[PDB]
Amino acid sequence: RDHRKIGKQLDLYHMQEEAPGMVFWHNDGWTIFRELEVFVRSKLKEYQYQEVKGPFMMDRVLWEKTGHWDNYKDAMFTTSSENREYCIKPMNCPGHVQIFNQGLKSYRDLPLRMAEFGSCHRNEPSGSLHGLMRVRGFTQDDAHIFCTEEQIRDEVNGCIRLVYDMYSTFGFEKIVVKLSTRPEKRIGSDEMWDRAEADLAVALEENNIPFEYQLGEGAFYGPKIEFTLYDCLDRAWQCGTVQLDFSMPSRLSASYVGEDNERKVPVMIHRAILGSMERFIGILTEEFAGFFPTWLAPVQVVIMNITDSQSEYVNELTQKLSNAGIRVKADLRNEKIGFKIREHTLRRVPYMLVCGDKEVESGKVAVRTRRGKDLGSMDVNEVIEKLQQEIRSRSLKQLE
Amino acid sequence: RDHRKIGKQLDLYHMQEEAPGMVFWHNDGWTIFRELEVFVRSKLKEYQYQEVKGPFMMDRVLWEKTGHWDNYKDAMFTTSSENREYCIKPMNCPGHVQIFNQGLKSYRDLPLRMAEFGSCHRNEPSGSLHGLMRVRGFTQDDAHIFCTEEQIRDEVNGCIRLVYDMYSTFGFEKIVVKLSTRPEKRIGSDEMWDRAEADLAVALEENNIPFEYQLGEGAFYGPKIEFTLYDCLDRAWQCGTVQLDFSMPSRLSASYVGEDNERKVPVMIHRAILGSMERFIGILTEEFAGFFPTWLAPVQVVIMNITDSQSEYVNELTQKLSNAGIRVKADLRNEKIGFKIREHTLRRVPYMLVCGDKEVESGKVAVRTRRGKDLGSMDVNEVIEKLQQEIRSRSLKQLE
Ligand SMILES: [Zn+2]
Ligand SMILES: [Zn+2]
To answer: Which residues lie near ion ligand 2 (Cβ < 5 Å)?
Structure first.
């Protein structure tokens, strides 16, 4: 149950000294990452998020306007070009504000949800690096919501429901929620902080989430909600974050025309559900010990023949399953059938399809799961539709 | 017919001085970019490429091993981390060799086709930057093929077929091809170069492609084939490149176990069809003058009502088209039908559905193209079928 060992065994990823804390995604690992992209994207459509893409580096002058340069300059990678300093972005927030600043915005346009699979880079200490979970380069399921003060409580409601929607997909039901209150050094009045913390507190009340305060741990520009999930080994993982911000939109001159025809600064909500997806894949690898759900598996079906008298029956069925959008491979090697099954059981392939002349004539397939249960011979069309339903529903459990 | 002018009008992207030569992709522009990813990935499956993902930056020590540091140090962004220097990758070639080096490779594993949507950054002179077409940060439809010397002809043939397959999708048929022979300073013997240039020359001759010798224009590590497509304005655009490399795999300790059990250094083919994806989108924007094909359009269908008595019929119809994988949005505003239709014609929306009392009862839609042609009132399921076929087939033309 160590993702670094399982990652090398299943040929998912590797890392090396020439790029500390940066991931070489192999084909199978990149398949798992891309499937997470689709799953998150399906949520963005349902929750009505835009998806954007910001550049990897911006002028250091811009990063000074945000106030983050004075705080986290050592964690930033800096480069030079024609006597100008550029910073590789460790966050997507200033970039999203820049998209927001293009073209006059009105209250008609709010709330405006803006998501990005933004690649961020942080100059993390090398001694702290560990596998997929403490890295220098990571992709964040990041989003930013621009809205009015009145729309804060409803927008946070969507973020809260989004958090439990996505976690329950992976089987994470034990979630601990903490709210961070105002720190010693902060901006804004006490009154503004009172309603900001109330909006987070109320939004958790309307969802029946019991939570717990983390006193003084909030950022200097707003309180936040942090979600912590517990794996099958009862290890806490802090993944979700909903962060209010009353500083950055004003620092970057973001504005909209309100109902009263006066110019107003919008409120920014920073939200991430999975946090670092490279880290999240590490959690999934150890939570499932490599036995990924069928929708996440790099190879979903392997079809084998007993002899060569079925090699192109396998070939036709491999094509037939491929046209169904199933990641399927064929194993026509001159090896014992037991040797082939142990080969792909070791690789954690969800389903093994075995074809003898018993099933070739009847147009059926013997089906075996990686766990070992033999489901007998069933119609190919019935097998394909069952496989589709499992993949489309992202079912945690296989057949029976 | 200016990609920059069309980009701002259709809200595709924007650029600013805070990140010169770098593109902020908006929601509509990022839809076009992601659709090209799907199209390219469709070709990768057909031609059996692996898709991997390399790190965004790597140690400058490795870049000195490749020999690229001596020649292209001025074009590389560099950063520091714990008294070590790292270069943001201007190319994906060393990263793919690192992935290939993990695990001993046999001759049975070749040809190894490895593709990546690599994000490369180059310190281009800011005075030369131009919109989407000369940029500092770009994404490349990149790939590298590892094979033996006997496999070069067959692999180059596949690259040539893929070049014309993808260009024909976008309506580019006039393509000019040039072969760059040996330069004054080069590695390897004459016989190696004689064989290498012959393989490129023979492959171009077999495919009956007229080609012009670019005498002395090849790289020092191998000859190359460059493809230039001509747009509807008869302007030349150099996009495709096929480079043979006999230096880097030996420099980076790449090897495989041959059928004679003697370890050999493989041959690398550097391959890109579209070149920079930002640049290709710019060419496509000017080629169509914003009238994107239905499969690339950010919004494919707009459904409108006549009065408020059909707002519900549009809403279910929009959802019904949405479930069919069609990018559809509803326009239920309180504006005249002529005002609505112009609003979405200016936005180059391919199709516009109109619902009065006549079609709500009959379960039909009045369908109009952005060219201005009325197609009458047809069945809802029939227009959904025809829309999917046009999207699935990537049709340049519309209905009729
Ligand atoms: Zn943020
Ligand atoms: Zn290359």
So the answer is: B 93, 270
Residues A316 and A334: their CA atoms lie apart, in Å, by 19
Ligand nearest to the CA of B115: 2
Q: Which of A17, A24, A126 is the best residue to mutate to test the B interface, defined by the most B CB atoms within 10 Å of its own CB?
A: A24
Question: Which residue ranges form the domains of chain A, and what is each CATH number?
Answer: 3-288 (3.30.930.10), 301-392 (3.40.50.800)
> How far is Cα B365 from Cα A261, in angstroms, rounded to an integer?
39
Q: List residues bridging with A291 in a β-sheet.
A: none
Cα radius of gyration (chain A) = 25
- The amino acid at residue A164 is Y
Enter the tokens of residue B335: 């504006």
Residues 107-126, chain A, touching B (beta carbon < 8 A) = 119, 121, 123, 125-126
Name chain A contacts of B113, Cβ cutoff 8 Å.
none
> d(Cα A80, Cα A375) in Å, to the nearest integer?
62
Looking at all shown ligands, the one closest to residue B94's CA atom is: 2
Give distance in angstroms: CA of A92 to centre of ligand 1: 6
Q: CB-based contacts of A358: which residues, under 8 Å, 6+ apart?
A: A366, A377
Q: CA A211, A214, A215, A219 torsion: positive or negative?
A: negative
* Contact at CB, B62 and A121, closer than 8 angstroms: no
Any idea what DSSP says for residue A334?
S
User: Nearest CB to A22: which of B19, B33, B56?
Assistant: B56
* Strand blocks (E) in chain B: 13-14, 24-25, 50-51, 57-59, 78-80, 85-88, 112-121, 137-147, 175-180, 211-214, 224-230, 236-245, 256-257, 263-264, 267-276, 301-305, 328-331, 351-355, 364-369, 374-379
| CA distance readout (Å), B399 to B290, B328, B374, B390 | 18, 17, 11, 8
Q: How many degrees, rounded to 5, is the angle at CA A324 between CA A321 and CA A329? A: 35
C-alpha to C-alpha distance for A36 and A38, rounded to whole angstroms? 5
Which residues between 55 and 84 in chain B have a beta carbon less than 8 angstroms from any beta carbon of chain A? Answer: 55-59, 61-62, 77-82
- Give CB contacts under 8 A, 24+ apart, made by A160-166: A160/A203, A160/A204, A160/A207, A160/A209, A160/A225, A160/A242, A161/A207, A162/A43, A162/A47, A162/A271, A162/A273, A163/A227, A163/A240, A163/A242, A163/A273, A164/A207, A165/A43, A166/A39, A166/A40, A166/A43, A166/A273, A166/A274
Going from the Cα of A244 to the center of ligand 1, the distance in angstroms, rounded, reads: 9
Cβ distance of B77 and A78 shorter than 8 Å: no
3-state secondary structure of B84: coil
Q: Which two tokens stand for residue A256?
A: 């909209």
Of B11, B27, B95, the CB nearest to A51: B27
Residue A129, chain B, CB below 8 Å: the answer is no
PDB resolution in Å: 3.1
Amino acid identity of residue B45, one-letter, is K
Q: DSSP characters for A127-176?
A: GG-BTTTB-SEEEEEEEEEEE-STTHHHHHHHHHHHHHHHHHHTT---EE
CB within 8 Å: A18 and B78: no
Q: Which chain A residues touch B125 with a CB distance below 8 Å?
A: 82
Cross-chain residue pair B81–A126, CB shorter than 8 Å: yes
Among residues B74, B195, B213, B191, the alpha carbon closest in space to that of A79 is found at B74
Give the separation between CA A353 and CA A317, rounded to whole angstroms: 10
Q: How far is B111 from B230, CA to CA, in rounded Å? A: 32
B300-319 burial: b if 16+ Cβ within 10 Å, else e: bbbbbbbeeebeebbeebbe
CB B85 within 8 A of CB B60: yes
Radius of gyration of chain B (CA): 25
Residue B330 phi, psi (nearest 5): -100, 145
Q: Which pair of tokens denotes residue B357?
A: 């009392």
Do B318 and B303 meet the contact criterion of CB atoms below 8 Å apart?
yes
